[PDB]
Amino acid sequence: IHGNWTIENAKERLNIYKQTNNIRDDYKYTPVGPEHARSFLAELSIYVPALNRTVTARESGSNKKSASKSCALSLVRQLFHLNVIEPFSGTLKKKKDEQLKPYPVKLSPNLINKIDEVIKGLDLPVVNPESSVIPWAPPQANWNTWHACNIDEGELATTSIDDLSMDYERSLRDRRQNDNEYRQFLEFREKLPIAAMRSEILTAINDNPVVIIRGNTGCGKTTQIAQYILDDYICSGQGGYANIYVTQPRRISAISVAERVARERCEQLGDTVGYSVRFESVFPRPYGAILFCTVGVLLRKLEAGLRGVSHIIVDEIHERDVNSDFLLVILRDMVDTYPDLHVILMSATIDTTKFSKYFGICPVLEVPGRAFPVQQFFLEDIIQMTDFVPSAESEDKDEAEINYNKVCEDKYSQKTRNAMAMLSESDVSFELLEALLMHIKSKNIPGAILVFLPGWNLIFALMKFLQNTNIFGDTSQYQILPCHSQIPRDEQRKVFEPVPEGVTKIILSTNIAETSITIDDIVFVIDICKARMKLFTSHNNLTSYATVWASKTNLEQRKGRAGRVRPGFCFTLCSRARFQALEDNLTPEMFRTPLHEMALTIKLLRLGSIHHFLSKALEPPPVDAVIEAEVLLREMRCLDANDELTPLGRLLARLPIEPRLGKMMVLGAVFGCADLMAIMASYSSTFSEVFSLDIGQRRLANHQKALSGTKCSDHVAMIVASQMWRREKQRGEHMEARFCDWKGLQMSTMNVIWDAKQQLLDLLQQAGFPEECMISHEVDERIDGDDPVLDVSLALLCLGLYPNICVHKEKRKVLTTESKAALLHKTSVNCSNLAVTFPYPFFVFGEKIRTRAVSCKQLSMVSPLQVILFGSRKIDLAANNIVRVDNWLNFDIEPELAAKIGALKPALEDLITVACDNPSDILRLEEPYAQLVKVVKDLCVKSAGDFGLQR
RNA sequence: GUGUAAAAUGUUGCUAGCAUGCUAGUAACGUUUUACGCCC
Numbered sequence: 001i002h003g004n005w006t007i008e009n010a011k012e013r014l015n016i017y018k019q020t021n022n023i024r025d026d027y028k029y030t031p032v033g034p035e036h037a038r039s040f041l042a043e044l045s046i047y048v049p050a051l052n053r054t055v056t057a058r059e060s061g062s063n064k065k066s067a068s069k070s071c072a073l074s075l076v077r078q079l080f081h082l083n084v085i086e087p088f089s090g091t092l093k094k095k096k097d098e099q100l101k102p103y104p105v106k107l108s109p110n111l112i113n114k115i116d117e118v119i120k121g122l123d124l125p126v127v128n129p130e131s132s133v134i135p136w137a138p139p140q141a142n143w144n145t146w147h148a149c150n151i152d153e154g155e156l157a158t159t160s161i162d163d164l165s166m167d168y169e170r171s172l173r174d175r176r177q178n179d180n181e182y183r184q185f186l187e188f189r190e191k192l193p194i195a196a197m198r199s200e201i202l203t204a205i206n207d208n209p210v211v212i213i214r215g216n217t218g219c220g221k222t223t224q225i226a227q228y229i230l231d232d233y234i235c236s237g238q239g240g241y242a243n244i245y246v247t248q249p250r251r252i253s254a255i256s257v258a259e260r261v262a263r264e265r266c267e268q269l270g271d272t273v274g275y276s277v278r279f280e281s282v283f284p285r286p287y288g289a290i291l292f293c294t295v296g297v298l299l300r301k302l303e304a305g306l307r308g309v310s311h312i313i314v315d316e317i318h319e320r321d322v323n324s325d326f327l328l329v330i331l332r333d334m335v336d337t338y339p340d341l342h343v344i345l346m347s348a349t350i351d352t353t354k355f356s357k358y359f360g361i362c363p364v365l366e367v368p369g370r371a372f373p374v375q376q377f378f379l380e381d382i383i384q385m386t387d388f389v390p391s392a393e394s395e396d397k398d399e400a401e402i403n404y405n406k407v408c409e410d411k412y413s414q415k416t417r418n419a420m421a422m423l424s425e426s427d428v429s430f431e432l433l434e435a436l437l438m439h440i441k442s443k444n445i446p447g448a449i450l451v452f453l454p455g456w457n458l459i460f461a462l463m464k465f466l467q468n469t470n471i472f473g474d475t476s477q478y479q480i481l482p483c484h485s486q487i488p489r490d491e492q493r494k495v496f497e498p499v500p501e502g503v504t505k506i507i508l509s510t511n512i513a514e515t516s517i518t519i520d521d522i523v524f525v526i527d528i529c530k531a532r533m534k535l536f537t538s539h540n541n542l543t544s545y546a547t548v549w550a551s552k553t554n555l556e557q558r559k560g561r562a563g564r565v566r567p568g569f570c571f572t573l574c575s576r577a578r579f580q581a582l583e584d585n586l587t588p589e590m591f592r593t594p595l596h597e598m599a600l601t602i603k604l605l606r607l608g609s610i611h612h613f614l615s616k617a618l619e620p621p622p623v624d625a626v627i628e629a630e631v632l633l634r635e636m637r638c639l640d641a642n643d644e645l646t647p648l649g650r651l652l653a654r655l656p657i658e659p660r661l662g663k664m665m666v667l668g669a670v671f672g673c674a675d676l677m678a679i680m681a682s683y684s685s686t687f688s689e690v691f692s693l694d695i696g697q698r699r700l701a702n703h704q705k706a707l708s709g710t711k712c713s714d715h716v717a718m719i720v721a722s723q724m725w726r727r728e729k730q731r732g733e734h735m736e737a738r739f740c741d742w743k744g745l746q747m748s749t750m751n752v753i754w755d756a757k758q759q760l761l762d763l764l765q766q767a768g769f770p771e772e773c774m775i776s777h778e779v780d781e782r783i784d785g786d787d788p789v790l791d792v793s794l795a796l797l798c799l800g801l802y803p804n805i806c807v808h809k810e811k812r813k814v815l816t817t818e819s820k821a822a823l824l825h826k827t828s829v830n831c832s833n834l835a836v837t838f839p840y841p842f843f844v845f846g847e848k849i850r851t852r853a854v855s856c857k858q859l860s861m862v863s864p865l866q867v868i869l870f871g872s873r874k875i876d877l878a879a880n881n882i883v884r885v886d887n888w889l890n891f892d893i894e895p896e897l898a899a900k901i902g903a904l905k906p907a908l909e910d911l912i913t914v915a916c917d918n919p920s921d922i923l924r925l926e927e928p929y930a931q932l933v934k935v936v937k938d939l940c941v942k943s944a945g946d947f948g949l950q951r
Numbered sequence: 952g953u954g955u956a957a958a959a960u961g962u963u964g965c966u967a968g969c970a971u972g973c974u975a976g977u978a979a980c981g982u983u984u985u986a987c988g989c990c991c
């Protein structure tokens with residue numbers, strides 16, 4: 001009854017018990033009765049090695065299988081009677097894991113005495129359980145616009161701006177006279193649509209303060225309007241008294257548009273057109289030049305001043321990203337206060353009425369967009385055409401989910417015939433491409449093939465699948481090219497390269513190709529209205545790089561993205577039900593996003609209360625976002641609760657990194673490890689791959705794993721790689737490139753990290769911290785012992801990236817907070833196939849890749865002594881003398897020792913505050929603070945928490 | 952994006968026997984669940 005003592009249940013425990021006994025016997029069958037009333041008596045003997053009480057089953061049935069089942073019934077009943085078998089044994093039985101045992105403290109008495117002296121030498125008692133605007137000026141002599149300062153030397157110090165304007169004018173006249181490649185580029189730009197209303201757009205801008213351009217995508221407009229403004233300003237011989245400032249919302253888009261405008265101008269990058277993306281600047285000449293930058297770089301430059309720039313040409317606003325709307329909200333008042341500035345907002349296809357209404361009903365210009373509506377087809381249309389039904393043959397939820405695929409009427413074509421024949425919907429197959437090919441060959445429509453896959457992972461998977469199906473994946477006849485941010489610029493520049501007809505172009509891309517760039521020859525668009533949704537859930541610190549449906553506005557744009565003049569075809573892979581069911585627009589990301597970084601930015605520019613500023617924005621954000629920004633600023637001691645920016649906050653604002661790494665960079669110079677902190681912050685915030693993985697590789701190679709050395713950490717590997725790269729860069733790069741390739745170095749990532757380290761140390765120098773601590777602290781990896789610099793660097797790392805720590809159980813299988821299973825990313829140095837146990841069973845990662853908290857990246861072993869030092873914002877005490885870390889980690893330490901360790905929590909903040917207050921003398925601290933530095937260097941040593949008992 | 956053993960279904964052919972059928976299994980088949988152990 002209670003143990004469901006029947007045949008097809010409760011037998012799992014019996015099977016396991018017999019497996020433990022290894023008895024391979026079964027039921028012997030004996031016939032009883034005639035052939036018309038046949039019965040079988042089955043026998044089985046079971047030996048019990050634990051109770052020494054052998055049992056037997058002798059039961060009858062209508063057949064051999066029935067006899068065996070009847071015997072097993074009585075066997076389970078007798079095993080229960082024996083009180084040795086486990087009851088129930090249903091289909092519900094899992095196997096999980098938890099903490100086994102740490103090395104809780106077990107320190108030497110020296111460190112205990114040091115900690116006691118520190119807690120008594122610093123008196124840290126613990127209990128044992130207004131709206132102004134940024135000034136702007138017109139162009140001025142001896143003043144550089146880019147650097148926002150006075151050059152006071154060179155040529156402008158003695159040369160008037162009018163002379164520079166005349167020089168630019170004569171140079172452009174000579175270029176008009178002779179530059180033939182410029183002639184062909186300008187004729188291409190003239191046949192380009194915007195050159196229709198050249199003068200018109202050159203005048204409307206002077207007419208009004210706020211100017212909105214509106215014209216369908218693919219006009220080649222961003223790369224032309226700024227150049228036309230410069231040309232108009234220089235044709236009057238005034239190019240010196242004019243500069244152009246443009247902001248894109250994506251880094252790679254900014255790089256691409258800068259390269260395009262340089263190539264069309266037939267000029268080397270950095271002469272008259274330059275770009276300043278985060279951690280990279282190629283600033284051009286100070287006068288008569290164009291600047292492209294991301295919104296973040298402009299928000300950074302806003303601190304100094306917009307002096308010396310003529311017109312600002314803010315790019316795509318339909319993105320609705322937080323940065324662009326913040327910039328627009330500031331720029332509204334900026335251009336209202338100063339009537340001599342010209343703000344330009346650019347869109348692609350959006351009801352710009354709200355944008356115009358925001359700026360006091362500003363003019364909404366228009367571009368004549370030649371177009372031809374394209375044939376739009378859906379899943380019913382494609383099932384009518386060439387079959388569409390089959391496919392490749394918190395946990396859950398409620399009934400609120402509606403499957404529109406299964407809610408429809410079968411008034412369409414032979415749905416059952418298509419189902420019984422074939423199809424492949426979720427994964428594309430020969431069907432779609434062959435249908436397009438036959439449509440082209442029968443209706444005579446040679447044209448490019450365009451698809452919008454949501455993510456780079458799916459892009460790579462489908463590219464590999466189509467390469468496997470190379471009969472129709474034949475690049476010689478069916479050219480295939482991806483397009484995404486991650487891939488190098490070589491693929492982007494190859495995409496634009498045309499191919500002869502017959503070599504069909506099948507472009508695989510994502511939301512990037514919907515704007516920014518546009519291929520002229522696109523005819524047929526195969527949309528799936530799927531896009532990446534890399535959302536960070538800061539309310540619980542879970543990442544989700546999932547895929548979500550595109551908005552109806554975006555879907556309409558994609559429908560219009562193809563078919564310039566040719567008919568064009570839209571092969572939408574969705575039903576009309578979902579087509580009309582999804583939201584018309586896209587949810588404003590500004591509504592749901594933490595605003596701590598923007599709060600620090602607004603407090604840096606002394607723009608008054610954040611609440612009032614957010615009220616006077618495009619969309620009044622919900623009070624939760626401003627409240628959470630306030631909470632983060634108050635708890636992190638960047639901004640006081642009384643809207644008073646402490647020097648810590650002002651220092652953090654200038655840092656081009658998130659505050660969670662600025663808090664580490666502050667302490668980096670405190671403990672004489674600033675180089676390590678700069679390198680780690682650059683390698684962490686700038687999400688990048690450490691090593692150049694070769695094709696067909698599933699793990700890290702021999703040297704790729706040996707570079708981490710005895711430390712066996714990817715962060716230590718990166719540090720030593722940077723050290724060897726810089727000592728090699730001390731020599732020539734001709735052999736350095738092949739050496740880095742041999743060492744599996746990413747080269748470009750290393751350059752980025754080095755430049756970021758240089759910029760961070762320059763910023764720290766400007767802050768006031770001494771140069772002496774900013775010296776090389778070279779760490780070797782072959783040493784398996786201890787090194788104070790490296791262990792304090794790792795302790796600071798664990799301080800910063802909280803709560804991205806994890807507990808290792810076995811192989812890839814690791815545990816994360818709230819007891820979540822996870823694996824180790826392939827790029828990590830801790831990837832292998834054999835079972836290895838690490839010296840310390842605690843790891844901290846950088847990123848949580850893949851939505852279902854599975855992939856962890858940037859793993860590095862951490863000392864078991866973090867506990868309360870650098871492991872959390874909260875520590876607790878559990879039963880049976882257990883210290884609780886992040887409510888998912890257990891240590892076994894005396895409450896007195898736990899309180900002693902936890903008393904350091906206010907001390908860290910006090911040290912940070914003192915370091916920020918007096919940057920000039922961080923090396924020469926107060927004597928209790930020198931003792932604190934000494935004790936923290938002593939405590940975080942790798943082989944420290946093992947005294948008394950190594951176990 | 953996987954294999955092993957166990958159990959319910961029906962199936963392929965065969966087997967010992969009974970007044971064309973029948974009483975039982977056999978080797979194999981796929982389905983569904985169970986755990987065992989991989990790789991992302």
Ligand SMILES: Nc1ncnc2c1ncn2[C@@H]1O[C@H](COP(=O)(O)OP(=O)(O)O)[C@@H](O)[C@H]1O
Pocket residue numbers: 216217218219220221222223260316346347348496515516517518
């Ligand atoms: N790398 C390039 N080489 C040549 N022409 C380009 C390049 N990139 C863009 N163009 C042209 O410039 C135009 C750019 O349009 P775009 O910047 O997307 O305008 P908007 O952003 O207003 O839609 C396109 O029509 C395209 O033909």
Ligand code: ALF
Pocket residue numbers: 222248253315316346347348515516
């Ligand atoms: F210039 Al755009 F989207 F129109 F980047």
